[PDB]
Ligand binder design. Structure first.
Ligand code: MG
Ligand code: ZN
Ligand code: ZN
Ligand code: ZN
Lengths: 49, 404, 51, 479, 49, 35, 115, 260, 46, 67
RNA sequence: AGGGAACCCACU
């Protein structure tokens, strides 16, 4: 173990990757939420190009 | 209280007001004071300061109250005039053929704070008693001031022909002995320019009488506007088919002229003017052709407008808009410029990948040949976006330079 | 050269064609939160006592 | 190019530029090159054929997707450098033969020119009919508009959130709005708007609103604020604990009542709260004795009802609470509104239904905006939207305001509106509400999509008369 | 944003189809913060081997 | 074979719809992070 | 925060008077009638009825401010008449017309319902 | 110097609208009657809601607002009821209110629609209009399994001037001088304006000739009811209410004149 | 005294004592919600 | 989120029309025909139905807090 | 009894 990497939501290595809308709603996630951001201490962060 | 809007650019950015308590959560302002503050009601916020002693209260009362600020020493002319609805409406109100019945007159007199309670004799007694707009407005004018002005649509040769003193179009404003004898009121007569009616009222009567003059114009005219109405719609943006064909012919001829200039330059038959390289000469000729086309189409569009057209109503009153705005809505939008030049070749020898290389024609370099009503083509849309970006940037940088 | 000050207020502005040019409409909550110190005299003691 | 279009050795992402005048060929596989897809033109024909459209129409079943278009070499990604060498047709109409051909050597065609716009500018109807700074202004204001920001908002404890009661999708849309999910999560209401002078209270960009409509839920919204707090046991000397403090033991208790708290030191959902009301009771033991109040109070000047109360442990295992307070916001004088055309204003006054001007049917405007906005702003898109919206409400369809559409012009819309029994330019005869008299001028009136912006006067109003001061300089605090 | 040259804040011709010509903040950042056009894509890179 | 104008409008929006069905709107973020 | 209660537009506050009468001193035989918690409905009908009276020289009304609930009616009559008399007679005429209209509407409804 | 003598004709009378013409009156009276239809005809509506349970996806004020907007049959009761502010009762009594209760829980796997049919009244004659024995019931909220709504509400007398929920109309059509003989409007291009349904012009004529001696007579109304009152009862209640306003003003003015 | 909380996962009510860590007795979930108040809540229907 | 009870503009009841309108659409009515069948004549009421987005179904997709 | 700095977004 060498550290932890914050994971971008709905990316390949997120727990939501590939879930159906019904599965997302069971997790209390909005199916329309596009992802593409991080959660750091509860706060949603987006990287600006 | 002292009222203030930032940035505080001149004396009239901080003026004294008397407080009136009202229900909801906003500061409420009379429309005429928006001009000194450079304020509007699209989310602006203003500051209030309450003087805390009789001495500061007396200072504000005697030096800085709004009425004392009506004329500015920056340019020896009023800083406040009649604006927006009141201006458009008063222009309509004072037209020669505005007639009011007994009841309408009584209502308007209801809104005249300085009225002495005597209903004037109507201008028309038979077959029916009718008052004109000019008679009521004469009731609004203070004292016995004397003022001559001209309406904005006053023809230039009228003053030298016959009818100099009996205007066919009612375009000469004459206030004599406090009475509006003739003429259509507009920005030239009720605005902030030197020698306007409001200026003469301030100079002849005090700040107090003139304060009442501002307020009464507003209350009486707004209440008449409740009958007259004022709108702007799609129908004001249209022109007749003959006008459209004339505009299209003008544009087509201008395009062919630019083609001829290009073909001349391509054969080395073009000679530079003194003090100009050949490319500057070619650009001068092209820009001249396109400017002439824009002017001619604008004139055609302006000629097509009827007296009921609402764009024209707001332009002639001086309340909002210009003849250029009308030309761009009805006729072409015209040339788009960046840094004073036609659209540059941002790609290699091309303004966009949709053109061929070395295309100096109007479409390629940013001449928008459509009106806003017709809608811009994609390339015109992008070139117009480049042009507009220029203005946004100018604002956002000039501010700091000027502030320093 | 500049400072923050007491006895000041700020809010959105909205038009009122029914005010004189020298008036300003002020909401009640602002009017209730800002004060002017009035000196008691025999002229005004009753009015101020009720206040 | 053949290899890239087959996807054999060169992936679609790769850029290959030939500078003919120079004698350089430049190939880029870097990351970070911006590109866009374009239709390939060979000779003077699209490689995209009717069969590709047929296969895409059934993509639900046959699974034929966008990737198959790219694989069949019918579409290509072109980055800016390669675009320098492309001869691009705006529409397939440019490939049609013409008396004097302009180019006749096109290599590519646009899929649709409206794709030049981003997400926010794609919701503007008829943007090609507005002055460009106005499109720029809407592009910002649309990000300030209240809607339903996300479907799972009930489970989110965001610091700030606004939710509109009754969002509608616009009667007049662009085709690119289908992909932005604006239908699903709309941020506005189609409003009956009249462009008129009426009593003077919409001058200088202000608007007049119908109070009876507001009474019925027009643009009513709800504001949420979340407060968070945690109890820290950092040191054996001092520890913070959630509790309902009492004035005998705790010392720094404000004069606010603490009886709204439960025995766990927390307020319960459904309790009404006002500014300077305690919502989380918390005490810290000292090194009126042995306890210092450090409770959380509702922000000053705000009010609402506790919506929900969540209790957890944070990362280091300390007890942790978040409290969401809800506040219903009824639109009022000073609140800010905007159409999609950069026409923004604050509400200047509200009239009840009977005071509003009316058509010969019972119809009164929801909003009255002032005609002096248009002439210098030149937002003709707004007027055309109103005209088409009137047609679309009468006909029972959604108007198409996609920008560069030749099948739509003002005359066609006007002709349609005449068929439904209205004046073809959108004007109506209105009657004055106060007196019942007709208004001499006829009034432009129709449905227009309006937005309620987050800027509300009750979050801005502020006054001071000798309050708190800064420590270093003794001048009034900021904010 | 403190710099006052217009040139990098201008809408360059090559933004066509890549960056929205309309969406940009109207403050100090005008022209410096941009937004992708709807169909724009950014390459992730690949090996030239 | 050839798409005709009256069909062209529907065809172009079908192509664009398929594009967005495949990619979404934040594909650049997700692809960059996956890489 | 600063919203007035809705009932404020039609409920008299404690001590507030429904109607006050003052003389207009600029001209003879003129009165101002201030009415609290009324709006254009009453003001307009009363003014129009007064204009029907041949002994009324001036009749008009206004709402001084839309956010307040007061109307002012100004009436001037000939010297052989009184503005108080004109105001009273105008209200009586309006009541009579409304009573007749209600009777006739009842009769018309009955006719329509029968056939 | 005296009163008008209006006449009335009913041209259409259904359960939801009444269409009629008033002749030989003045525009001010016609408009005042219109205004009274909208804002000063009393009606019964829910104006007090106590929520005992609400597990729906809609917050309490949302539900309460929707309940306030449900029209209730008021046709004969409303004249009997007193205004709650005037009643001597301490909270709410049958002389100034009507009690409603609602208690719905979703125990099944299909969505439960809470409609106005679930509003149970204490008065058989004051009920949701859609519950009167086609028109569906008004949706209040939708529940999924395990969610519940339980509340108690009181309906009281009021008029549209206070809140639009007490407005009995669903559109008041009003119109005079269909052919523009008085020129109270001026058409820039008269020929492109469609005819009024009350026009009596030929298809080749756009507007009537100007009438210099004309006055507005003959006002056309189409009063549509929201269901709380019958349309004719709306009209009659308006006439009576405007008359009452005038009578009260007359009494106050008599006191004021006598007091000086 | 009871202080009933609802589990965020299994929706089970369960007692919690101040100074007791947050944890559902059934499923061990660490997020709980307070129950609606018993105080009188009354709205005008406006 | 849920169909408004009244038309904002005129106050006509529309809150009892949404399920019927959805029914008519699935029975192959065009929106204009369905709105005519429901008696929605003024374009304000028609706007109410035409532009509604029934977001409450999406909200009903989430499990409630209390069983 | 009451902090502060930094940065970001936004409004006129
Ligand atoms: Mg501004
Ligand atoms: Zn009672
Ligand atoms: Zn559990
Ligand atoms: Zn309606």
């Amino acid at each position: 173990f060498i550290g932890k990497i914050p994971i971008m939501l709905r990316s390949t290595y997120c727990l939501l990757n590939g879930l159906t809308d019904r599965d997302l709603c069971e997790l209390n996630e909005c199916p329309l939420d596009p992802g593409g951001y991080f959660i750091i201490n509860g706060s949603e962060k987006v990287l600006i190009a | 209280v002292i009222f203030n809007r930032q940035p505080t650019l001149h004396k009239m950015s901080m003026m004294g007001h008397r407080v009136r308590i009202l229900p909801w959560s906003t500061f409420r302002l009379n429309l005429s004071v928006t001009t000194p503050y450079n304020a509007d009601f699209d989310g602006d916020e203003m500051n209030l300061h309450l003087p805390q002693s009789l001495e500061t209260r007396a200072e504000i009362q005697e030096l800085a109250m709004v009425p004392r600020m009506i004329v500015t020493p920056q340019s020896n002319r009023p800083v406040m005039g009649i604006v927006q609805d009141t201006l458009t409406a008063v222009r309509k109100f004072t037209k020669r053929d505005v007639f009011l019945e007994r009841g309408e007159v009584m209502n308007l007199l209801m809104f005249l704070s300085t009225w002495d309670g005597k209903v004037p004799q109507p201008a028309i007694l038979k077959p029916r008693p009718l008052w004109t707009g000019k008679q009521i407005f004469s009731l609004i004018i203070p004292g016995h001031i004397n003022c001559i002005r001209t309406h904005s649509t006053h023809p230039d040769d009228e003053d030298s022909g016959p009818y100099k003193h009996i205007s066919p179009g009612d375009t000469k404003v004459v206030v004599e002995n406090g009475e509006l004898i003739m003429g259509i009121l507009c920005k030239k007569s009720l605005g902030t320019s030197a020698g306007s009616l409001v200026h003469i009222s301030y100079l002849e009567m005090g700040h107090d009488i003139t304060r009442l003059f501002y307020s009464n114009i507003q209350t009486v005219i707004n209440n008449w506007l409740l009958i007259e109405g004022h709108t702007i719609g799609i129908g004001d943006s249209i022109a007749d088919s003959k006008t459209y064909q004339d505009i299209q012919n003008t544009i087509k001829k201008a395009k062919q002229d630019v083609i001829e200039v290009i073909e001349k330059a391509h054969n080395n038959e073009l000679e530079p003017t003194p003090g100009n390289t050949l490319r500057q000469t070619f650009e001068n000729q092209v820009n001249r052709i396109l400017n002439d086309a824009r002017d001619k189409t604008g004139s055609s569009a302006q000629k097509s407008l009827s007296e009921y057209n609402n764009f024209k109503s707001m332009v002639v009153s001086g309340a909002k808009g210009s003849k250029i705005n009308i030309s761009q809505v009805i006729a072409v939008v015209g040339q788009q410029n960046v840094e004073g030049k036609r659209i540059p070749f941002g790609f290699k020898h091309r303004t966009l990948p949709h053109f061929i290389k070395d295309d100096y024609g109007p479409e390629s370099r940013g001449f928008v040949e459509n009106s806003y009503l017709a809608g811009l083509t994609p390339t015109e849309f992008f070139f117009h976006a480049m042009g507009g970006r220029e203005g946004l940037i100018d604002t956002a940088v000039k501010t700091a330079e000027t502030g320093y | 050269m500049g400072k923050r000050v007491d006895f000041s207020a700020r809010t959105v502005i909205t038009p009122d064609p029914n005010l004189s040019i020298d008036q300003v409409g002020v909401p009640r909550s602002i009017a209730a939160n800002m004060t002017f110190a009035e000196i008691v005299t025999p002229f005004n003691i009753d009015r101020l006592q009720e206040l | 190019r053949k290899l890239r279009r087959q996807m054999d050795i060169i992936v679609s992402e790769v850029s290959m530029i030939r500078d003919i005048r120079e004698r350089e060929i430049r190939i880029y596989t870097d990351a970070g090159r911006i590109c866009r897809p374009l239709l390939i033109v060979e000779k003077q024909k699209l490689l995209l054929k009717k069969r590709h459209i047929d296969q895409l129409k059934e993509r639900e079943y046959n699974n034929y997707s966008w990737q198959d278009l790219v694989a069949s070499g019918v579409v290509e990604y072109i980055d800016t450098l390669e675009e320098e060498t492309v001869m691009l047709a705006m529409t397939p109409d440019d490939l049609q033969e013409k008396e004097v051909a302009y180019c006749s050597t096109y290599t590519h065609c646009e899929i649709h020119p409206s794709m030049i716009l981003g997400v926010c500018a794609s919701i503007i109807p008829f943007p090609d009919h507005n002055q460009s700074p106005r499109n720029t202004y809407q592009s910002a204001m649309g990000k300030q508009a209240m809607g339903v920001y996300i479907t799972n908002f009930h489970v989110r404890m965001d610091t700030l959130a606004h939710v509109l009661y009754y969002p509608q999708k616009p009667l007049v849309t662009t085709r690119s709005m289908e992909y932005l999910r604006f239908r699903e999560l709309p941020a506005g209401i189609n409003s009956i708007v009249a462009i008129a002078s009426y009593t003077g209270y919409n001058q200088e960009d202000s608007v007049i609103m119908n109070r009876s409509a507001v009474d019925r839920g027009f643009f009513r919204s709800v504001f949420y604020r979340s407060y968070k707090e945690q109890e820290s046991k950092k040191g054996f000397d001092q520890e913070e604990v959630f509790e309902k403090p009492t004035r005998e033991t705790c010392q720094g208790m404000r004069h606010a009542i603490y009886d709204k708290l439960d025995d766990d030191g927390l307020i319960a959902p459904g309790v009404r709260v006002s500014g300077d009301d305690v919502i989380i009771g918390k005490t810290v033991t000292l090194p009126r004795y042995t306890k210092r109040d450090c409770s959380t109070f509702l922000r000053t000047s705000e009010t609402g009802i506790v919506d929900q109360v969540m209790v957890t442990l944070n990362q280091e295992g300390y007890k942790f609470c978040k409290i969401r307070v809800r506040s219903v916001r009824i639109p009022q004088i000073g609140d800010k509104f905007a159409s999609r055309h950069g026409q923004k204003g604050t509400c200047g006054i509200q009239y009840r239904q009977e005071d509003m001007p009316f058509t010969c049917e019972g119809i009164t405007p929801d909003i009255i905006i002032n005609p002096h906005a248009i002439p210098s702003r030149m937002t003709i898109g707004h007027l055309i939207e109103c005209l088409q919206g009137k047609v679309s409400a009468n006909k029972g369809e959604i108007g198409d305001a996609t920008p560069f559409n030749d099948a739509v012009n003002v005359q066609k819309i006007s002709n349609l509106l005449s068929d439904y029994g209205y004046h073809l330019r959108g004007n109506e005869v209105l009657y004055n509400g106060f007196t019942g008299r007709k208004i001499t001028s006829q009034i432009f009136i129709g449905p227009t999509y309006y937005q309620r912006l987050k800027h509300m006067v009750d979050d801005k109003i502020h006054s001071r008369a000798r309050g708190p001061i800064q420590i270093l300089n003794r001048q009034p605090m900021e904010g | 944003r403190d710099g006052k040259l217009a040139k990098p804040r201008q809408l360059h011709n090559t933004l066509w189809g890549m960056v929205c010509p309309a969406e940009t903040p109207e403050g100090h950042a005008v022209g410096l913060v941009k937004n992708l056009a709807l169909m724009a894509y950014i390459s992730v890179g690949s090996q030239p081997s | 074979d050839e798409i005709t104008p009256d069909l062209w409008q529907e065809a172009c929006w079908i192509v664009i719809s398929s594009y967005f069905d495949e990619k979404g709107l934040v594909r650049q973020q997700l692809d960059s992070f996956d890489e | 925060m600063n919203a007035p209660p809705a009932f404020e537009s039609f409920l008299l506050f404690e001590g507030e008077k429904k109607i006050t009468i003052n003389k207009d001193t600029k001209v003879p035989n003129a009165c101002l009638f201030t009415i609290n918690k009324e709006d254009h409905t009453l003001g307009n009908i009363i003014k129009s009825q007064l204009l029907k009276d041949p002994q009324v020289l001036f009749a008009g009304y206004k709402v001084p401010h839309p956010l307040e609930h007061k109307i002012i009616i100004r009436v001037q009559t000939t010297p052989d008449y009184s503005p108080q008399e004109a105001f009273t007679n105008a209200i009586t005429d309006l009541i009579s017309e409304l009573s007749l209209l209600e009777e006739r509407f009842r009769v018309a409804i009955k006719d329509k319902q029968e056939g | 110097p005296y009163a008008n003598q209006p006449t009335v004709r009913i041209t259409e009378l259904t359960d939801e609208n009444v269409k009629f013409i008033i002749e030989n009156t003045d525009l001010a009276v016609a408009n005042s009657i219109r205004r009274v239809f909208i804002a000063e005809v009393p009606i019964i509506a829910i104006d007090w809601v106590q929520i005992d349970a609400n597990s729906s996806v809609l917050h309490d004020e949302f539900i309460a607002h929707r309940l306030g907007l449900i029209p209730l049959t008021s046709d004969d009761i409303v004249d009997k009821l007193q205004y709650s502010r005037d009643c001597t009762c301490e909270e709410f009594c049958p002389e100034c209110s009507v009690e409603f209760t609602l208690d719905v829980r979703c125990n099944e796997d299909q969505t439960r629609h809470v409609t106005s049919r679930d509003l149970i009244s204490n008065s058989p004659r004051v009920i949701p209009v859609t519950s009167r024995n086609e028109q569906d019931d008004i949706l209040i909220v939708k529940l999924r399994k395990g969610q519940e709504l339980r509340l108690r509400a009181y309906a009281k007398k009021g008029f549209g001037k206070e809140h639009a929920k007490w407005n009995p109309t669903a559109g008041v059509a009003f119109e005079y001088d269909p052919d523009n003989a008085l020129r109270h409007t001026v058409y820039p291009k008269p020929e492109e304006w469609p005819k009024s349904e009350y026009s009596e012009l030929d298809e080749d004529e756009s507007q009537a000739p100007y009438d210099p001696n004309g006055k507005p007579e003959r006002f056309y109304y189409n009063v549509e009811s929201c269901g709380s009152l019958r349309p004719e009862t709306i009209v009659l209640s308006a006439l009576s209410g405007l008359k009452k306003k005038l009578s009260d003003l007359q009494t106050q003015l008599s006191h004021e004149i006598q007091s000086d | 005294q009871p202080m009933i909380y609802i589990c965020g996962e299994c929706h089970t009510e369960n007692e919690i004592k101040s100074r007791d860590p947050i944890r559902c007795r059934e499923c061990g979930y660490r997020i709980m919600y307070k129950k609606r108040t018993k105080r009188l809540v009354v709205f005008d229907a406006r | 989120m849920i169909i408004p009870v009244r038309c904002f503009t005129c106050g006509k009841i529309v809150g009892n029309k949404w399920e019927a309108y959805l029914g008519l659409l699935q029975a192959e009515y065009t929106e204009g025909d369905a709105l005519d069948a429901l008696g929605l004549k003024r374009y304000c009421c028609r706007r109410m139905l035409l532009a509604h987005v029934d977001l409450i179904e999406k909200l009903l997709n989430y499990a409630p807090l209390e069983k």
